[PDB]
Symmetry: C3
Subunit: 209 residues, 3 copies
């Protein structure tokens, strides 16, 4: 019966979480997972309103003696507008991508992002690429804009200062895990984050509807 | 007599400093003081035009073996618009505040800021909060916008690039002091910064009028 | 003859590189070279669309026991609008420039920038200043805006979010070289960057026309 208000409230509880996230009041989140030759995983996460981005350098461990980055997986929350996703990369600690005079400052990589799904629902977006063995490090920057459900100008006369503030307010986290197993068990799963593991298995929590 | 031009110029000297600061040509400044279990104090200061903010992580010293953060005091210069103040925090190195799906990206904490006064003049604003003993660290972000004395649109077609530049131009300082006494004697007082100590004593310099 | 299409294409190849850089699709780049008492050189480079800036602290090596910064050379790519260049500095790890109440948040230093030329062509802009011996460090911030060839409003309703993204996407590099010779041989020259050495010799590559 629909006299089951406990069930109805539980249903609304989950749904409202899903919907608040995709409102412009909600966060847009990016994760950069760097996979090292020793099986360890380094993750950078930043969460912010309106837009979010990361600019990082992943270096060979122990002054060049330890493990080296082998691959990168970039994850965006479902609140991102996939068409706004941009990436700039260098394979070096020294401006790797050809010459400044001829470089485009970014590529629109949205079309390469796969949908991470649980129960038919999009829990995130994933772009995975491996690094050339010939390289010991990668400088990488990625950026995404929150879906704008309306025709609302977040960058209009009055609203632009809020976006400037969003830049100050963004929170960044950096963690290293010993293996993807630890990553899944202690980072991804407990926080209900979207993820694809090495076996192409999807993680995350469907909240709609 | 008002034939005392030395006195009159001294009066204008002080007043002009007070007033330039609160003009849009002046700085808005934020300080984040982190109080550690060993009595030491770590301070982060950033100063910038138009708006300013800080995003930091305060961790337990010596890889988790040393002292731990116990409390935070956030200070804004008098040039801040208290109503624009925003704060986002996590108690963890891992996205502490519940779940991303349900998180508001900030809280307006202005109403909790006390006025730091010297001689009846507001020299700054202070928000103090203690950290749960149960936690070994805190990731914290705070943001404030300069008071806009006029109806001037700093984020208008032409002026927005200046605000973007203000972001590049902001200066950040990080210092650690052995005790609040050292902090007061060698940081707060010499630089004429506003402050409240553990005994609720106010520091700073009245310049008006 | 103009039947030499190999020559004509080579000519267009070089020219197009020059021109793309100065289009709003191209990068604006800044370098900050810090010259240390031991002859070593530390360089910070950031490259980004629309505008670029750096905010750094150059400290005495080995916790204050090693070499100390003696001089700074700031280089901008030719795509910068020299009139938009701004600099804010402190000689301390503690808000060096007088008192916050009376500080202008930056100086327009464009008029002090020399043109670095190769073959009559501007390959960059250079501002060089020495540091007071009395100081062990310098906190420095510099900012420049890309030349806007048109009357195009990059900070208009729609375009402002792209500039916000440009902030996320900017790539920063930090390198230390043992002597200016190494710097020239392994950093400046291989990457075709503009530069002036200690003997006032100009480096870079003319690409026009």
């Amino acid at each position: 019966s629909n006299r089951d208000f406990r069930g109805r409230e539980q249903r609304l509880f989950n749904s409202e979480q899903y919907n608040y996230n995709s409102s412009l009041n909600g966060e847009v989140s990016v994760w950069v997972y760097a996979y090292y030759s020793d099986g360890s995983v380094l993750v950078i996460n930043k969460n912010s309103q309106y837009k979010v981005g990361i600019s990082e350098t992943f270096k060979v461990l122990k002054e060049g003696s330890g493990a080296k980055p082998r691959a990168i997986q970039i994850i965006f929350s479902p609140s991102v507008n996939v068409r706004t996703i941009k990436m700039a990369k260098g394979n070096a600690v020294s401006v790797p991508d050809e010459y400044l005079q001829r470089s485009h400052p970014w590529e629109a990589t949205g079309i390469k992002y796969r949908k991470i799904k649980r129960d038919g629902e999009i829990v995130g977006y994933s772009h995975y690429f491996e690094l050339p063995h010939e390289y010991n490090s990668i400088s990488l920057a990625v950026s995404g804009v929150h879906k704008n459900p309306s025709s609302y100008n977040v960058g209009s006369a009055h609203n632009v200062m809020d976006v400037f503030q969003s830049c100050d307010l963004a929170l960044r986290f950096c963690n290293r895990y010993w293996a993807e197993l630890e990553l899944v068990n202690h980072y991804i799963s407990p926080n209900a984050y979207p993820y694809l593991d090495i076996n192409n298995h999807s993680y995350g929590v469907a909240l709609s509807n």
